[PDB]
């Protein structure tokens, strides 16, 4: 996260870390939505341009962290995956549209004060919080600069930007399943996500029922905290039916 600060213990209980086995390295972030499901960005698992195509057998999910490199004995849980689901229409050829994937854990996880799930948004909450200017929060153990890795989970709060602006900042085709957030060069405030944060949650706190809802996933961007550029996130609500369908079709 660039120009973000250290998180508080138990501030983002749903933050997951996708860790690889050999080599043992961080890959992406992800969120915990039920005791068996993790939600991440499909390009953390499959990105053919770089021959990336991970399978169950290759990842570990570390839930409960704060620290990036330390096995927080007695605080974090490490699960194995049972099945990975990528959106059947994830487009890795053109603009990372439908950049979402679901992973089912081998066994359910036990929640604590460090592990708790986030809510997935409902049409009404989506409608009322996704307005330009409303701030959302992103977290991750990603880089701190474009080109400088943090020991702790970072947090930055970013404003939603207007689609026209999101579109007049890039040459990529933005679709309805994306949204962007970030300050304008003009608003003398920085922050953004960066490499290592892909797959994590973008959440907002409903002022109506004091709950945190995950509205987006870190998908892509061009650089990290560049002026005139913004970060794009997958539109969770817009892909929520997919979510439900694979959950009730394959478990809970």
């Amino acid at each position: 996260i660039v120009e973000g600060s250290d998180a508080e213990i138990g501030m983002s209980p749903w933050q997951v870390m996708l860790f690889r086995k050999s080599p043992q390295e961080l890959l992406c972030g992800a969120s915990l939505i039920s005791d068996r499901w993790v939600l991440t960005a499909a390009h953390c698992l499959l990105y053919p341009p770089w021959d990336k195509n991970f399978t169950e057998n290759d990842l570990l999910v570390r839930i409960g962290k704060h620290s990036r490199t330390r096995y927080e004995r007695n605080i974090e849980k490490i699960s194995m995956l049972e099945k990975i689901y990528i959106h059947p229409r994830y487009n890795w050829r053109e603009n990372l549209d439908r950049d979402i994937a679901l992973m089912k854990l081998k066994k359910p996880v036990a929640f604590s004060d460090y592990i708790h799930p986030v809510c997935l948004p409902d049409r009404e909450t989506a409608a009322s919080l996704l307005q330009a200017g409303y701030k959302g929060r992103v977290t991750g153990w990603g880089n701190l600069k474009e080109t400088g890795q943090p020991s702790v989970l970072q947090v930055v709060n970013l404003p939603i930007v207007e689609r026209p602006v999101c579109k007049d900042s890039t040459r990529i085709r933005i679709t309805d399943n994306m949204f962007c957030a970030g300050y304008k060069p003009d608003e003398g405030k920085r922050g953004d996500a960066c490499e290592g944060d892909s797959g994590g949650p973008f959440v907002m706190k409903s002022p109506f029922n004091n709950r945190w809802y995950q509205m987006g996933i870190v998908s892509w961007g061009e650089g990290c905290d560049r002026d005139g550029k913004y970060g794009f996130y997958t539109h969770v609500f817009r892909l929520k039916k997919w979510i439900q369908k694979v959950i009730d079709q394959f478990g809970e």
């Binding site: 860790f19 043992q24 390295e25 961080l26 570990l60 330390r70 096995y71």
Partner: peptide, 11 residues
């Protein structure tokens, strides 16, 4: 850079 994790999580 990461600290070792308990062998029972690799198998």
């Amino acid at each position: 850079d990461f600290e070792e994790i308990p062998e029972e999580y690799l198998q």
